[PDB]
Amino acid sequence: LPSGSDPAFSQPKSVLDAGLTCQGASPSSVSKPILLVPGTGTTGPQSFDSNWIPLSTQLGYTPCWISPPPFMLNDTQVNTEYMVNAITALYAGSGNNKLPVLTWSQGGLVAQWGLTFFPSIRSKVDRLMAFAPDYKGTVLAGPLDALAVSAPSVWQQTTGSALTTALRNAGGLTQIVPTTNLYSATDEIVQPQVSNSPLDSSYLFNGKNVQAQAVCGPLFVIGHAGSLTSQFSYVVGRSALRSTTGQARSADYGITDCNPLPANDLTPEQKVAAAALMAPAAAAIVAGPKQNCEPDLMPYARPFAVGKRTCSGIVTP
């Protein structure tokens, strides 16, 4: 696992700061912040307005989020710079108190990438609550060879990618801070997720790995977005946030919580918006960046994926 000083940011501080917003507060002075990291093809508000923004507010947090441009489609390594910068700012702005990080989709990959390669934030994050994280990427678009022109982060989230290779070899498939991963065997975006074991893309060693169907049975169906928004997901997430251990507790959730519909506490309007969470991604991609190669790894990540192919060529020693 990488140690010592943080790698330098490729983006200017002003650019990174511009990507961070808190509800009714500035990052420099915020009470009980929670950092929300969005999914591929979305901004922070698009990922969370219908769900964790109001839900974390009702639990006593000030929700904050990053919106790396354009819509999380750029290089995941750059998206991570936004998160690392945000944690540094929010830790300082809350009186040097650790804060929780809650994520959806790529957001979890970003969080774990940050924790793997930027040691400074390990003492600033008290827990990670990741919904449908794709630490191994996904196999559903097929192999990297044969991918059509795609967004930078879509390359990186393809199973076999240089990015996912580097994360694994650097020790990033083991939890770094107390982590809960809530995911679904019926995820239509991220696979494989079916085994309820370390094979699953959402699994971290030593983490609290909660495949919904392991608790709820074979008839429980939630998709990629439902993994974030469901009532079951809320109970698990609430457990993780409140836990003195930093992970969700089995005593806090069971079969009686196996409601696949959006969280009960959301307004009817919020439930509808939550159900339609995937919608904005479609427009985002069409107008979004596309290329025929995976972005180069940053120098800090290269020793963990020698021999993998990126835009400049094969990663050399």
From Swiss-Prot:
It comes from Pseudozyma antarctica (Yeast). Hydrolysis of triglycerides. Is very stereospecific both in hydrolysis and in organic synthesis and has a potentially important application in glucolipid synthesis. This is Lipase B. It catalyses: a triacylglycerol + H2O = a diacylglycerol + a fatty acid + H(+). Glycans are attached at N74. InterPro entries: AB_hydrolase_fold, Stereospecific_Lipase. It is an enzyme of class 3 (hydrolase). It comes from the Eukaryota. PANTHER family: LIPASE B. GO terms for molecular function: triacylglycerol lipase activity. The active site is at S105, D187, H224. Keywords: Cleavage on pair of basic residues, Disulfide bond, Glycoprotein, Hydrolase, Lipid degradation, Lipid metabolism, Signal, Zymogen.
